Specification:
globular, six-stranded antiparallel beta sheet, binds 2-acetamido-2-deoxy-beta-D-glucopyranose, binds bromide ion, mainly beta, blood coagulation cascade inhibiting toxin, about 270 residues, disulfide bond, complement system impairing toxin, hemostasis impairing toxin, 2 domains, 1 helix, 17 strands, binds a molecule of 3 linked components (NAG-NAG-BMA), four-stranded antiparallel beta sheet
Length: about 270
């Protein structure tokens, strides 16, 4: 009936922080409860902040009437500043011509227990990724396929970035089926910086075979400045631990690394593609 856009994943226990309605053609949009908003031919902006000790967990925008648009291939809703895992969001909606009204809902969790690990990891992390999509494997190497029906940019050779419902993804490097899911690690806003890193176990049984990396970040513009996520050197068999480096140009608000393991891997999986 409307068209629905999501940043983050709603869960039942989430508190309701804010909901409101906006006419998108109005000059100026009608401020609701002090949150500055604005309308344009091209943009709707809501400057939201919660003066309470909560983390934003999910934002949903529904627009009317329903139009023709596969939103999984675009990012028309995003936080220019703040976002998931913080108490603020400068919410940006890139509207289309026929879109004239919008309903906004914003959910949160206590800042004390600001963890999203469960809702993104789920029950079957081995076979289901953090988008709710099941890993799929090609017939030659048995390594995971590139997702086909969602937003994805490429940059430098080997760099592929995915976006769905506000959540970004990059994969280092290939998943194989006999790999097992070891643990998932999250960094929350209090541990995030322009450049930060985490240390992973890498000895014996827990030989890191594959990293599935997800994050939310601010984007100044519709096109994001993607981060440089990379091992600090090679993650070889002798390394007792492996350090993952997050070298960002735009600030991340929350990050989640799925750690897959395999004693049989040597750290390097490559196809004859060049
Ligand atoms: C319709 O409304 C949107 C939202 O307000 C306008 O987009 C805004 O445009 C200005 C100017 O292009 C952007 O300013 C930029 O700010 C950064 C802050 O660091 C600065 O580095 C840039 O050089 C630039 O000055 C602003 O960010 C941008 N806002 C969003 C949310 O994208 C748009 O211009 C309006 N359309 C008009 C006026 O025709
Ligand atoms: C592997 O160990 C070497 C020796 O200290 C180190 O220089 C390198 O950064 C390690 N690799 C990772 C990914 O931590
Ligand atoms: Br603005
Ligand atoms: Br959760
Ligand atoms: Br953790």
């Amino acid at each position: 009936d409307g068209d629905e856009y999501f940043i983050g994943k709603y869960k039942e226990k989430d508190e309701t922080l804010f909901f409101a309605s906006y006419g998108l053609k109005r000059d100026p949009c009608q401020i609701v409860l002090g949150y500055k908003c604005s309308n344009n031919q091209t943009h709707f902006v809501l400057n939201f902040k919660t003066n309470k000790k909560s983390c934003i967990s999910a934002i949903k925008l529904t627009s009317y009437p329903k139009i023709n648009q596969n939103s999984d291939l675009t990012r028309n809703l995003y936080c220019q500043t703040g976002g998931i895992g913080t108490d603020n969001c400068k919410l940006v909606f890139k509207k289309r011509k026929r879109q004239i009204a919008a309903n906004i809902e914003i959910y949160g969790i206590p800042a004390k227990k600001c963890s999203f690990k469960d809702r993104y990891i789920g029950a079957d992390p081995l076979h289901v990724d953090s988008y709710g999509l099941s890993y799929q494997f090609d017939q030659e190497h048995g390594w995971n396929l590139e997702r086909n029906n969602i937003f994805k940019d490429t940059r430098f050779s080997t760099e592929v970035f995915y976006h769905k419902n506000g959540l970004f993804n990059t994969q280092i490097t290939y998943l194989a089926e006999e790999d097992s899911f070891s643990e998932a690690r999250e960094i929350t806003a209090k541990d995030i910086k322009k450049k930060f890193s985490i240390i992973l176990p890498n000895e014996e049984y827990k030989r890191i075979s594959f990293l599935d990396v997800y994050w939310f970040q601010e984007t100044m513009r519709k096109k994001p400045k993607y981060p440089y996520i990379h091992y600090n050197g090679e993650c070889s068999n002798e390394n007792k631990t492996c350090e993952l480096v997050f070298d960002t140009d735009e600030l991340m608000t929350y990050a989640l690394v799925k750690v897959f393991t395999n004693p049989e891997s040597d750290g390097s999986r490559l196809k004859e593609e060049d």
